[PDB]
Design a protein around this nucleic acid. Structure first.
Ligand code: ZN
Ligand code: ZN
Ligand code: ZN
Lengths: 59, 198, 237, 199, 197, 144, 157
RNA sequence: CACCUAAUUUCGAAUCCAGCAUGAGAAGCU
């Protein structure tokens, strides 16, 4: 009753998707060993709900 | 003709899985390193032949149950065209109703394929007389396939599922007597019409 | 289930309770936008609100209100941890590799590329070998030796096939092949020959390996037409 | 034909079990910590080769008995196809009727797998001249395998059980001289139909 | 063919100590004891037995004047021709004599105790160091089986001579302090290899 | 010497303002004209060098009725016999010493080997008969 | 333009064409250049984003590796492991050869395989130093030359 | 009947092997 009065949901015993955002121009890609790899230079930014990969212009 | 049966098969490996490389160029490229390479794609994913295993399962089970079922296993044996696996998998004239896809892996060769060492040990001196390297697919690796049955019947799915549990009992791929190829199959079926695209 | 209110869409799905912005009475898991009072009058405080630059300042207020705010092929990380905290941002100074598969895009480090470069190096090196593209016995003696080693399965159809492939690559490649095959292992004591069938001891087996070595050595000095007419009789392909 | 034999074996370990890791990349990952990794699945359970042990046991005893059995242990030796173990475990033109599964532990890694230290001592000095670290399976660990005999005969279960008792006497895999791999077997067999899945 | 079975029954005359070897069983036990005795997971005592037989036979056969390889030196290679090479293995062959571990007939709650040893200064006679070690009690019975695959007329004699050298020297660790003096009883028999059929 | 890329530059990446591409081609010296060509190139010339090294009466008709009735002497057999023939007939009857696999069609095993021998006999005799006679004989059995 | 930036040696003669198998990087004034460029560029940008040998003759190298291979100081496991650390760079190979060669102060046991024969103590340590100097000087050579040197001793490198 | 102690050090590597053998066909519609 007092956390319902604090307006937070209470159970008495939804989907969250931690997604990885690329945010990188992947149109410039090459084939070496039957792999579509790209040499990459950026930063793994770890904010909540989103581990976005951000380039050097973001920095 | 107005409906089709879609059987999505997701198979995981409980035992290490080996099926042999078939492409000569890929196989002669691989023996510079390994003696028994695993059959893979050109997109580095593991491929297993699937129609032959399901057909062989249905022929052994249906011959042992007692139905009039032909045997296509023998050398240059002709399918009769009258049994239920001739209708389901193929005949010499009529095509097969079940278009059984290949078992395409979800991961590539660096994740699931691992080259290992097999032996041949003398029984008296207990020393390794021979040694050879062979690739194998790891346990817990998952594979996807789709069985599309056109002109379906009521008992086609029961036959396919019984063949799948027989493949769980025996194994798929090669080296089945040594413990390889034991798998577990998950089945998602569905009725479709052929004009979903229309 | 989609109710309405004063323009408010309240689409209930099996996953989440969206509210596109009177207020409802149930849980509003996602809210899309004095409004703070519109937030504060609404029961079961929303999980994450979905909010021109004034927005961000408003989002700071939404940050201060203890409410998450978002401002508008699967990708996997095979990375490390390291970490850092610079300008209220948890970071990682890493340069790597974006690998594109049919369903997954993965982020791999330079060590995986060194793995791939070692494999590609070892693949390239075993393509071009030496100069791609002797004893002597009579032709009939070569016939009866190849017949005798065919019957006892020392020279098999596969060995004749690789002999013909190494003979088409030239003289020196075939010399390298037979010196590799007849190489007695000093630490093991076996050569790369099929053992003969029959009740034999070590001396005649070693002698038969020696005549296999001498027969395949003396066949190399002959031309390609004689070698082809010598080996079609045993290996038709 | 109409029936097939199912032989479920449950083997418990009495002295520590080693069976070496086969995968070259799994070896190269594990040699930074353990010099002798144990054979393991990707699902972190212990794999043991089983078909070769039963086959070698049957060839050793049927050769000592005097029966016509080929040996498939010498270098590049081929099976003739007319023996008694040639029928059970295969030959060049025919496969083995007894498909023998790998011995897979009921428990997992980090529960039966224990990494240990082994020694080599000078005889004149009594000092640890060498040291290595090997990965073993503890005693009392339980492994489960299945043998599927496709065309059963009257003497298949007796031959399989006799080979199992020889594996109890000699050890199943690894350093069998030092005392590793001494196990015991529990056998449960039934003649199932071939068409049991055809409901 | 024939196989030689030597069932050895070992009674422990002085305390015995073979240290644990598993990392997860030592580092979980250093808060309780400093030298845990070597054990099974079924709470039974393990003693390595093939190495003691091999070390015994190499000492006595080396001092008798016969050519034997010395596998005691670091990274040594067995010659493959000597008597201990034929019995206990070599590089390229295997041991005819498969030597089991010395399994105790009792658990650890019956025949393992936890002792307190010291280290005493010489000038002042005071307990300078203290450590605790698990030892096997006296009269604990251990059993093992030596299985010889291709037996000769001189394998049982060499095994018995190695056993007598073990009772004279000691088995396991802490041998110079008096730990590990044992007594051996042998039951030898010659079975047929096809006996399980 | 002047050096020419035969490789495809139409797949690239931008790293550190350098337009780079991992490649696995072979450098070839060719008479003061160096080149770097792909793996396909070596596949093509390995194939070219391999091909360059590669540059070096009533009872008879009744037996054909029985054999084509159980389809051991089938339509493609009659065609390839017409296409021919002694070396062909030698090559389609010779038992493989390893597997015992005669290249005929399946029709007891003693009757199977007698039928196989019957075919070899009938096939050899019809080649003895002159053309046209056999040709007409063979048309109403497999018209082609 | 093309600047090859690689040694044009190790040129075998397949058919009538002096080829030479290669794996490198094309960088645009186009310049084909080897793995050393990728090491330089990777170190350069990987540290720019972190901001918040003995010389003995080739014939003597081959002869000494052959001699130490016959007496089993250098073995197929050592020639393969040293090749793996050589592919990892010229700094991992230095670390691996130093780790194998070093005398542990408590034991005195070098990590080499002991020689096979009747060599005395000073000769054994001289051959250990010969293995150290030979495998140290072998690193100063390029990957292709190292590969042709050790491919005779270990055919499955 | 008490009381103190219950720690510490070295090693944790080395080697062999990684090969063979078999099968490359035939049908129908057309
Ligand atoms: Zn049919
Ligand atoms: Zn046989
Ligand atoms: Zn010796």
């Amino acid at each position: 009753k007092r956390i319902i009065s604090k307006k937070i949901r209470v159970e008495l015993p939804i989907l969250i998707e931690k997604k990885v955002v690329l945010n990188i121009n992947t149109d410039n890609m090459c084939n070496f060993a039957s792999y579509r790899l790209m040499p990459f230079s950026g930063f793994i930014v770890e904010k909540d709900d989103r581990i976005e990969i951000n380039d050097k212009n973001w920095f | 003709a107005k409906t089709m049966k879609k059987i999505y098969v997701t198979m995981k490996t409980l035992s290490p899985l080996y099926t042999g490389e078939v492409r000569r160029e890929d196989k002669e490229a691989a023996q510079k390193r390994v003696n028994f390479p695993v059959r893979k794609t050109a997109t580095n994913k593991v491929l297993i032949p699937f129609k032959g295993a399901l057909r062989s399962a249905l022929e052994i089970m249906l011959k042992a149950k007692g139905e009039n079922v032909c045997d296509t296993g023998e050398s240059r044996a002709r399918p009769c065209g009258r049994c239920v696996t001739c209708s389901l998998f193929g005949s010499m004239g009529r095509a097969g109703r079940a278009s059984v896809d290949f078992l395409i892996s979800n991961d590539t060769k660096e994740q699931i394929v691992r080259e290992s060492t097999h032996l041949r040990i003398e029984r008296q001196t207990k020393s390794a007389s021979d040694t050879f390297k062979g690739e194998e697919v790891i346990e817990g690796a998952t594979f996807t396939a789709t069985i599309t049955i056109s002109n379906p019947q009521e008992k086609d799915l029961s036959l396919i599922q019984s063949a799948l549990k027989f493949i769980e009992e025996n194994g798929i791929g090669g080296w089945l007597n040594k413990g390889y190829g034991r798998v577990s199959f998950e089945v998602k079926s569905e009725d479709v019409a052929t004009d979903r695209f229309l | 289930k989609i109710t309405f209110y004063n323009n408010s869409v309240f689409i209930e799905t099996h996953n989440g309770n969206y509210l596109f912005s009177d207020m409802p009475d149930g849980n509003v898991d996602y809210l899309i936008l004095e409004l703070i009072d519109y937030i504060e009058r609404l029961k079961y405080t929303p999980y994450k609100v979905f909010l021109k630059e004034q927005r961000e300042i408003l989002a700071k207020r939404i940050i201060s209100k203890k409410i998450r705010v978002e401002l508008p092929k699967v990708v996997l990380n095979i990375n490390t941890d390291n970490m850092c905290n610079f300008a209220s941002y948890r970071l990682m100074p890493f340069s790597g590799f974006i690998v594109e598969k049919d369903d997954r895009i993965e982020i791999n480090d330079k060590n995986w590329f060194d793995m791939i470069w070692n494999e590609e190096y070892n693949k390239m090196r075993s393509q071009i070998v030496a100069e791609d593209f002797l004893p002597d016995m009579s032709h009939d003696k070569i016939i009866e030796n190849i017949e005798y080693l065919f019957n006892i399965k020392i020279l098999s159809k596969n060995r004749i096939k690789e002999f013909w492939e190494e003979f088409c690559k030239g003289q020196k490649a075939a010399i390298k092949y037979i010196t590799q095959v007849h190489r007695k292992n000093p630490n093991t004591g076996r050569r790369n020959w099929n053992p003969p069938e029959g009740d034999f001891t070590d001396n005649e087996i070693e002698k038969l390996y020696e005549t296999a070595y001498n027969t395949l050595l003396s066949l190399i000095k002959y031309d390609k037409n004689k070698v082809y007419n010598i080996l079609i009789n045993f290996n038709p392909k």
